[PDB]
Design a protein around this ligand. Sequence first.
Ligand SMILES: *[C@@H]1O[C@H](CO)[C@@H](O)[C@H](O)[C@H]1O[C@@H]1O[C@@H](C)[C@H](O)[C@@H](O)[C@H]1O
Ligand SMILES: *[C@@H]1O[C@H](CO)[C@@H](O)[C@H](O)[C@H]1O[C@@H]1O[C@@H](C)[C@H](O)[C@@H](O)[C@H]1O
Ligand SMILES: *[C@H]1C[C@](C)(N)[C@@H](O)[C@H](C)O1
Ligand SMILES: *[C@H]1C[C@](C)(N)[C@@H](O)[C@H](C)O1
Lengths: 7, 7
Amino acid sequence: XXNXXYX
Amino acid sequence: XXNXXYX
Ligand SMILES: *[C@@H]1O[C@H](CO)[C@@H](O)[C@H](O)[C@H]1O[C@@H]1O[C@@H](C)[C@H](O)[C@@H](O)[C@H]1O
Ligand SMILES: *[C@@H]1O[C@H](CO)[C@@H](O)[C@H](O)[C@H]1O[C@@H]1O[C@@H](C)[C@H](O)[C@@H](O)[C@H]1O
Ligand SMILES: *[C@H]1C[C@](C)(N)[C@@H](O)[C@H](C)O1
Ligand SMILES: *[C@H]1C[C@](C)(N)[C@@H](O)[C@H](C)O1
């Protein structure tokens, strides 16, 4: 992945 | 805080 969140 | 990231 690589991005983060949280959705 | 409470949200995430990463910026
Ligand atoms: C999310 O990333 C931060 C920044 O590096 C790290 O300190 C947290 O341990 C990390 O969260 C975990 O890992 C991710 C892969 C899971 O989605 C999240 O629930 C948590 O286990
Ligand atoms: C969230 O990411 C910060 C960096 O921005 C990292 O220093 C924290 O340890 C990380 O939080 C941990 O992981 C998340 C997923 C949890 O909600 C939090 O309680 C904490 O364990
Ligand atoms: C990460 C944190 C958040 C944005 N407050 C939550 O709504 C999500 C489900 O997880
Ligand atoms: C979180 C992940 C990211 C957007 N790939 C990175 O650029 C940032 C510094 O931390």
